[PDB]
Design an enzyme around this catalytic site. Structure first.
Site, PDB file in Angstrom:
ATOM      1  N   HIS A  88       0.866  -1.190   0.000  1.00  0.00           N
ATOM      2  CA  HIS A  88       0.000   0.000   0.000  1.00  0.00           C
ATOM      3  C   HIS A  88       0.896   1.232   0.000  1.00  0.00           C
ATOM      4  O   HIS A  88       1.560   1.505   1.023  1.00  0.00           O
ATOM      5  CB  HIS A  88      -1.039  -0.104   1.120  1.00  0.00           C
ATOM      6  CG  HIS A  88      -1.991   1.040   1.084  1.00  0.00           C
ATOM      7  ND1 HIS A  88      -2.858   1.236   0.040  1.00  0.00           N
ATOM      8  CD2 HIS A  88      -2.188   2.054   1.966  1.00  0.00           C
ATOM      9  CE1 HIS A  88      -3.559   2.333   0.275  1.00  0.00           C
ATOM     10  NE2 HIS A  88      -3.185   2.841   1.478  1.00  0.00           N
TER      11      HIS A  88
ATOM     12  N   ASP B 220       0.801   5.211  -0.263  1.00  0.00           N
ATOM     13  CA  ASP B 220       0.039   6.489  -0.212  1.00  0.00           C
ATOM     14  C   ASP B 220       0.752   7.555  -1.034  1.00  0.00           C
ATOM     15  O   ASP B 220       1.924   7.884  -0.764  1.00  0.00           O
ATOM     16  CB  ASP B 220      -0.157   6.970   1.234  1.00  0.00           C
ATOM     17  CG  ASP B 220      -1.057   6.087   2.056  1.00  0.00           C
ATOM     18  OD1 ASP B 220      -2.200   5.745   1.565  1.00  0.00           O
ATOM     19  OD2 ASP B 220      -0.635   5.747   3.222  1.00  0.00           O
TER      20      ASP B 220
ATOM     21  N   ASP C   5      -8.201   0.967   1.043  1.00  0.00           N
ATOM     22  CA  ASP C   5      -8.002   2.008   2.087  1.00  0.00           C
ATOM     23  C   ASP C   5      -9.034   3.135   2.125  1.00  0.00           C
ATOM     24  O   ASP C   5      -9.088   3.829   3.141  1.00  0.00           O
ATOM     25  CB  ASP C   5      -6.587   2.589   2.026  1.00  0.00           C
ATOM     26  CG  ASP C   5      -6.063   3.081   3.380  1.00  0.00           C
ATOM     27  OD1 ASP C   5      -6.439   2.492   4.391  1.00  0.00           O
ATOM     28  OD2 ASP C   5      -5.221   4.015   3.387  1.00  0.00           O
TER      29      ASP C   5
ATOM     30  N   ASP D 248       1.498  -1.303   4.358  1.00  0.00           N
ATOM     31  CA  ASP D 248       2.029   0.006   3.932  1.00  0.00           C
ATOM     32  C   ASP D 248       3.504  -0.105   3.526  1.00  0.00           C
ATOM     33  O   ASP D 248       4.358  -0.547   4.333  1.00  0.00           O
ATOM     34  CB  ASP D 248       1.806   1.055   5.011  1.00  0.00           C
ATOM     35  CG  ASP D 248       0.337   1.409   5.227  1.00  0.00           C
ATOM     36  OD1 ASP D 248      -0.560   0.716   4.669  1.00  0.00           O
ATOM     37  OD2 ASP D 248       0.100   2.368   5.960  1.00  0.00           O
TER      38      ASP D 248
ATOM     39  N   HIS E 129      -6.859   9.350  -1.152  1.00  0.00           N
ATOM     40  CA  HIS E 129      -7.624   9.182   0.116  1.00  0.00           C
ATOM     41  C   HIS E 129      -6.901   9.838   1.314  1.00  0.00           C
ATOM     42  O   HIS E 129      -7.456   9.775   2.395  1.00  0.00           O
ATOM     43  CB  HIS E 129      -8.013   7.715   0.316  1.00  0.00           C
ATOM     44  CG  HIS E 129      -6.848   6.779   0.389  1.00  0.00           C
ATOM     45  ND1 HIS E 129      -6.360   6.121  -0.716  1.00  0.00           N
ATOM     46  CD2 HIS E 129      -6.111   6.383   1.435  1.00  0.00           C
ATOM     47  CE1 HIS E 129      -5.337   5.385  -0.364  1.00  0.00           C
ATOM     48  NE2 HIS E 129      -5.159   5.522   0.960  1.00  0.00           N
TER      49      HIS E 129
HETATM   50  O1  LIG Z   1      -5.690   5.011   9.381  1.00  0.00           O
HETATM   51  C1  LIG Z   1      -5.807   5.602   8.108  1.00  0.00           C
HETATM   52  C2  LIG Z   1      -4.461   5.990   7.530  1.00  0.00           C
HETATM   53  C3  LIG Z   1      -4.659   6.458   6.061  1.00  0.00           C
HETATM   54  O2  LIG Z   1      -4.807   7.869   6.091  1.00  0.00           O
HETATM   55  C4  LIG Z   1      -3.506   6.109   5.116  1.00  0.00           C
HETATM   56  O3  LIG Z   1      -3.817   6.509   3.780  1.00  0.00           O
HETATM   57  C5  LIG Z   1      -3.209   4.617   5.190  1.00  0.00           C
HETATM   58  O4  LIG Z   1      -2.219   4.179   4.267  1.00  0.00           O
HETATM   59  C6  LIG Z   1      -2.833   4.321   6.570  1.00  0.00           C
HETATM   60  N1  LIG Z   1      -1.943   3.415   7.009  1.00  0.00           N
HETATM   61  C7  LIG Z   1      -1.990   3.450   8.391  1.00  0.00           C
HETATM   62  C8  LIG Z   1      -1.094   2.573   9.215  1.00  0.00           C
HETATM   63  C9  LIG Z   1      -1.368   2.641  10.724  1.00  0.00           C
HETATM   64  C10 LIG Z   1      -0.583   3.733  11.455  1.00  0.00           C
HETATM   65  C11 LIG Z   1       0.345   3.220  12.535  1.00  0.00           C
HETATM   66  C12 LIG Z   1       1.364   2.321  12.230  1.00  0.00           C
HETATM   67  C13 LIG Z   1       2.221   1.855  13.218  1.00  0.00           C
HETATM   68  C14 LIG Z   1       2.070   2.283  14.521  1.00  0.00           C
HETATM   69  C15 LIG Z   1       1.065   3.172  14.841  1.00  0.00           C
HETATM   70  C16 LIG Z   1       0.207   3.640  13.855  1.00  0.00           C
HETATM   71  C17 LIG Z   1      -2.891   4.400   8.771  1.00  0.00           C
HETATM   72  N2  LIG Z   1      -3.467   4.914   7.631  1.00  0.00           N
HETATM   73 ZN   LIG Z   2      -3.784   4.732   2.307  1.00  0.00          ZN
END
Ligand SMILES: OC[C@@H]1[C@@H](O)[C@H](O)[C@@H](O)c2nc(CCCc3ccccc3)cn21
Ligand SMILES: [Zn+2]
Ligand SMILES: [Zn+2]
Length: 998
Positions: free
Chosen positions: A60, A62, A174, A307, A437
């Site tokens: 994924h 972004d 997502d 991700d 997004h």
């Molecule tokens: O929740 C939505 C967002 C979104 O805005 C993004 O477009 C999407 O790619 C995304 N990936 C995550 C990973 C989780 C974060 C995280 C990772 C490790 C430790 C603590 C927090 C969050 N998000």
């Molecule tokens: Zn995303």
């Protein structure tokens, strides 16, 4: 054509209907926290009924979020794609899917020819598969359908052109909830299958229990089912590896071999060996067979990614080698009755359709949407319907400028030296990027929002340059036309972006007898019908009269230029004025007018009065009518034969009367505020977690400005955080809010309409500006769950009356009580909402929001069945939306003299039925092409019946040698048109045509 009003579609799952029946109980389900302990009969599987498992590696990416597009590219994505090219080349059974073409194009163009050919080889042998193939994986809430199609076209045109591939399977893991606008566009773009992930946890459980996670997704008005697209909804909390192998993330996390990053369930992955493979395989196949119980076939999709995964070559090795050891063991041991392999998304869908063709399963039908999304408890993601509303408005402006620029420049072939194709490509890509997004949603870090803004600023400037060159060409006699392709022949005038109160940037036309007595202005009308709209310009004198180029007088009004300052008071200009007049512009055409100065009051130019209601009572230079003064009071204006409007003491609407012999129907504008919880979960860029219902804003005794004229009148007031304005031009009024939330930390400012309309629990919001969906307010859900996207419009109605609010910008809204509409203006949030952004929303800036307000009588309108899931606008509400999204464009001639000037373009263009739009006109070929081709997207909406020429786009340009009905991306022919005449399109249909010219 289907009827879309009287017939109600028969579907297995109708999401409003399901919502009424669901309890939404948030029960601990065990290891699958939001489901139940899955049971399977193990004698389900034997040598004749094996489970077929496709493990689908993905990453994924972004296109902007915590880092900018370019930052992510240099830090992460370029390494992911370099390692994919190397690892897939070297390992023929290894597979990978890729979604974001913005990143793939950025990578591919930087490769040497050998690498480029290596890449082509792993796409052609099906190892690397593109999924969707949009520029981005777009937001589905705030995005306009036209921009979803634009970013899909941009990605797929790149893939067709550079990889000779067109995806027919979509991957949307997502976006924060899902819209039926996607299958609508995809199914008219040659797609056969799509996949979604982010749906309410309660919806996942309900569908899972009935094995309705695979479904034929049709539009809510589709009786026949020709819009149906096969859809796979993933069953679990995340797309990550712990939530994709099966129901128990503690087990699934042990098969994320990159985590040996760690598993929060505190059991790490173990390297697979001859010593443990029997045990490991038993654990994993048990998860797979549980996941398989939720679906109707013996074909299982197991995504393997997260991700920016597959960044290191050691991640490629550790995932590939451990899964090879698992597949080798599982495939060779009959007792499992499993065949497991790396696969792609298309391979999964191909196998599912083989099982369906062979009678192993029939799939249910579904209509509806998947808003509003909750990932857990009461954590509803309605905040991002409003977050960073400045950029949400900028999206709609740039949407229109790209359409205008593509349409104005499409009329001619341009020499390469004009750089028309280069500017339009930049404009399409920056607008396509923002559909991401984390773009339009307002969920990116401060510096990344800044990047999106700077890119969209460059895109706007590119559009202006293309539009002004095009106008000069279209209105200069060909015998004289001798262009300098770097010259500014016109400057654009836009009174609604950024808005004079946000940025005082509009150019004044400086007239005078010595210096420059007159100025040519030109209006463009992108819509394919005759349009009259009031237009305004800044002029250096109030003594200005308007003519066409034929010197026919045009009735005009002059108003002062007002601005608001810091409590909150207006100031008039002593040096510039607004000239206002009705432009009449042909379908997809141009009209030239002339502004001329004089000694004194012109014959055909009227002047507005200016009442400043205030307690302790301003020059206007040459302005012939002195500012009158008064104390706060109730006022009432009519313009033309259109509605009469009553306003409170405080400068806010309290009543509308439609016709002279109509009742005064009450309609109270009111500004409330929502706050943030001190205890428990905090609102952030994503989540709306209000600490109870909204409470009125402290209005005080605000200064009220009343401007009254023959053509246009206005009531403005300087409320705290909002300069609120009602503008009357003799139809539905226009509302403008200059919103400056300032440093009001932990506040959301909402604008509510209080009526006596007997709506009850029913209201209507649009999806992607394409369709209006019936909403039922549910007291069994929290307030934030009754908030929906308002991308272009919302309405309430009873048996007699409808109130419709049209928006120039996507915002969040609801009807929280009978006869209310409400829409959020801005939100400032000190706290992070724990979805990974790691900041609040503290970068608010002044934005000008725009609206039309349409109170109507519907008792004489054919409304759909009380059972129909859809609503439809009236002609008036639809034209009002068109006024907001695709207004007339204004051009001021830069030079003193315009030899060759013509009065009009497109006078001979067909004036198509009001319900038809040429959404897109785009020339598809450069000058070096022997045969010129132009693509058109035609959209026909459906208007409520309450009591014009044929448009054939094939013949809009001369010398048509060929016409094709195409997919919406223009990339494939669906129907050769022998008569080279475009058949007209049905209500709620969108079709594309490509016309060839000799
Ligand atoms: O929740 C939505 C967002 C979104 O805005 C993004 O477009 C999407 O790619 C995304 N990936 C995550 C990973 C989780 C974060 C995280 C990772 C490790 C430790 C603590 C927090 C969050 N998000
Ligand atoms: Zn995303
Ligand atoms: Zn053909």
């Amino acid at each position: 054509c289907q009827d879309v009003v009287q017939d109600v579609p028969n579907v297995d799952v109708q999401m409003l209907e399901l919502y009424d029946r669901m309890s939404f109980k948030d029960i601990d389900g065990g290891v699958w926290k939001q489901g139940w302990n899955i049971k399977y009969d193990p004698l389900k599987y034997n040598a004749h009924h094996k489970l077929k498992v496709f493990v689908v590696p993905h990453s994924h990416n972004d296109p902007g979020w915590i880092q900018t597009f370019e930052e992510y590219y240099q830090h992460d994505t370029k390494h992911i794609l370099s390692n994919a090219l190397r690892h897939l080349h070297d390992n023929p059974e290894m597979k990978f899917i890729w979604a974001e073409i913005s990143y793939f194009a950025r990578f591919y163009h930087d490769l040497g020819e050998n690498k480029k050919l290596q890449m082509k080889s792993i796409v052609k042998n099906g190892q690397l598969e593109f999924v969707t193939g949009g520029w981005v994986m777009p937001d589905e809430a705030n995005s306009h359908w036209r921009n979803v199609l634009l970013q899909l076209t941009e990605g797929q045109t790149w893939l067709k052109q550079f990889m000779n591939v067109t995806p027919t399977a979509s991957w949307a893991i997502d976006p924060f909830g899902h819209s039926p606008t996607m299958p609508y566009i995809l199914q008219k773009s040659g797609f056969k299958n799509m996949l979604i992930q982010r749906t309410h946890y309660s919806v996942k459980k309900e569908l899972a229990q009935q094995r309705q996670l695979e479904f034929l997704w049709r539009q809510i008005w589709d009786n026949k089912g020709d819009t149906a697209l096969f859809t796979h909804m993933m069953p679990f909390y995340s797309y990550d590896i712990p939530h994709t192998c099966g129901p128990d993330p503690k087990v699934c996390c042990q098969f994320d071999f990159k985590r040996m990053l760690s598993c929060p369930w505190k059991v790490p992955p173990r390297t697979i060996s001859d010593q443990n493979v029997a045990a490991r395989s038993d654990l994993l196949v048990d998860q797979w067979k549980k996941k398989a119980e939720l679906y109707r076939t013996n074909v299982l999709l197991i995504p393997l990614g997260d991700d920016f995964r597959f960044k290191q070559n050691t991640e490629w090795d550790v995932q590939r080698v451990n899964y090879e050891r698992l597949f080798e063991h599982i495939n060779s041991q009959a007792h499992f009755n499993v065949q497991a392999q790396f696969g792609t998304l298309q391979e999964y869908f191909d196998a599912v359709h083989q099982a369906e063709r062979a009678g192993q399963a029939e799939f249910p039908t579904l209509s509806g949407d998947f808003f509003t999304y909750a990932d857990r408890s009461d954590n509803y993601w309605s905040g991002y319907y409003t977050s960073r509303p400045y950029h949400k408005r900028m999206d709609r402006v740039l949407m229109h400028y790209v359409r205008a620029a593509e349409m104005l420049s499409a009329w001619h072939s341009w020499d390469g030296m004009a750089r028309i194709e280069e500017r339009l490509e930049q404009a399409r890509r920056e607008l396509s990027l923002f559909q991401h997004h984390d773009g339009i949603t307002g969920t990116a870090k401060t510096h990344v929002v800044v990047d999106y803004e700077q890119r969209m600023q460059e895109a706007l400037k590119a559009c202006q340059m293309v539009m002004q060159q095009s106008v000069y060409r279209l209105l200069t006699k060909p015998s004289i036309y001798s262009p300098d392709f770097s010259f500014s022949y016109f400057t654009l005038d836009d009174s609604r972006w950024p808005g004079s109160g946000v940025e005082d940037s509009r150019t004044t036309i400086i007239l005078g007898e010595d210096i420059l007595p007159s100025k040519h202005v030109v209006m463009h009308n992108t819509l394919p019908h005759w349009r009259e709209q009031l237009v305004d310009f800044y002029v250096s004198s109030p003594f200005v009269s308007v003519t066409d180029l034929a010197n026919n007088p045009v009735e005009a009004q002059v108003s002062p230029v007002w601005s608001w300052h810091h409590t909150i008071h207006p100031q008039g200009s002593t040096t510039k004025y607004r000239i206002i007049f009705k432009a009449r512009v042909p379908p997809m055409g141009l009209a030239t007018y002339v502004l001329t100065i004089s000694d004194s009051k012109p014959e055909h130019t009227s002047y507005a009065s200016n009442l400043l209601l205030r307690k302790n009572p301003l020059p206007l230079g040459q302005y012939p009518e002195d500012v009158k003064f008064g104390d706060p009071r109730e006022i009432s204006l009519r313009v033309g034969n259109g509605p009469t409007l009553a306003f409170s003491e405080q400068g806010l609407l309290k009543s509308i009367q439609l016709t002279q012999d109509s009742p005064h129907v009450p309609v109270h504008f009111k500004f409330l505020k929502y706050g943030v919880r001190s205890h428990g979960d905090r609102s952030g860029a994503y989540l709306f977690l209000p600490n109870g219902p909204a409470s009125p804003v402290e209005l005080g005794q605000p200064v009220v400005l009343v401007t009254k004229g023959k053509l246009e009148s206005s009531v403005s007031v300087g409320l705290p955080s909002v300069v609120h304005q009602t503008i009357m031009r003799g139809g539905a009024p226009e509302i403008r809010n200059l919103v400056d939330i300032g440093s009001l930390d932990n506040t959301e400012i909402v604008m509510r309409l209080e009526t006596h309309i007997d709506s009850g629990d029913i209201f209507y919001t649009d999806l992607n500006g394409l369709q209006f969906i019936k909403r039922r307010r549910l007291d069994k859900l929290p307030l934030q769950a009754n908030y929906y996207p308002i991308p272009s419009g919302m309405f309430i109605e009873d048996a007699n009356t409808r109130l419709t609010l049209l928006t120039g910008q996507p915002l969040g809204g609801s009807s929280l009580a009978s006869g209310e509409l409400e829409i959020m203006q801005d939100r400032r949030l000190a706290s992070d909402d724990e979805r990974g952004l790691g900041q609040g929303v503290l970068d608010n800036k002044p934005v000008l929001h725009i609206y039309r307000l349409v109170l109507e009588k519907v008792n004489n309108c054919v409304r759909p069945s009380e059972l129909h899931p859809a609503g439809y606008l009236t002609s008036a509400a639809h034209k009002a939306s068109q006024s907001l999204l695709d207004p007339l464009d204004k051009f001021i001639f830069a030079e003193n003299e315009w030899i060759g000037a013509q009065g009009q373009f497109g006078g001979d263009h067909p004036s198509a039925r009001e319900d038809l739009d040429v959404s897109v006109m785009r020339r598809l070929t450069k000058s070096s092409a022997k045969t010129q081709r132009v693509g058109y997207v035609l959209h026909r909406t459906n208007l409520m019946q309450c009591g014009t020429q044929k448009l054939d786009v094939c013949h809009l340009l001369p010398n048509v040698a060929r016409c094709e009905r195409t997919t919406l991306t223009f990339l494939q022919n669906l129907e050769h048109l022998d008569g080279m005449v475009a058949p007209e399109v049905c209500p709620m249909e969108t079709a594309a045509y490509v016309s060839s010219h000799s």
